[model samples]
Target: FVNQHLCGSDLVEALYLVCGERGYFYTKPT
Candidate 1:
């Protein structure tokens, strides 16, 4: 279960600090 709310780069950084490599981040889904 994941409960983190953040935008692309924001979330990218979040993941960088935590992890991920997806276009789902490069491109906004909404």
Candidate 2:
């Protein structure tokens, strides 16, 4: 995850990882 963000994927995978895991809000999946 972090590797992808720091290397090839950039902020796309970064944001997607955090956002999908409820980083800012209750965006977690059951």
Candidate 3:
């Protein structure tokens, strides 16, 4: 769903947080 150079897991988690859905879906941080 994302197409940008980012901090991988950091970015994903950030986006989720921004959408007000923290911990809604989990991704293994690298």
Model 1 alpha-carbon drift over 4 Å, by segment: 1-4, 20-30
Q: Candidate 3: lDDT over CA atoms?
A: 0.65
Query: TM-score for model 1?
Result: 0.36
- Tell me the tens digit of each residue's lDDT in model 2 across 1-30: 334326445554666687866654333344
Clashes of 3: 0
Lowest summed-lDDT stretch of 10 residues in model 1?
19-28
How much lDDT does candidate 2 score? Answer: 0.52
| 1-30: candidate 3 lDDT, tens digit per residue | 557676767776766777674456555554
Count of steric clashes across candidates, in order: 1, 0, 0
Best by lDDT: 3
The list of candidate 2 runs beyond 4 A from truth reads: 1-8, 21-30
Writing each residue's lDDT as its tens digit, candidate 1 over 1-30 gives: 377787757766765665454423344466
lDDT of each: 0.58, 0.52, 0.65
Instruction: Tell me which of candidates 1 and 3 scores higher on TM-score.
Output: 3
TM-score of each: 0.36, 0.31, 0.38
lDDT of 1 at 15: 55
Arrange candidates, best TM-score first. 3, 1, 2
Ranking by lDDT: 3, 1, 2
Q: List candidate 3 segments past 4 Å from native.
A: 1-6, 22-30
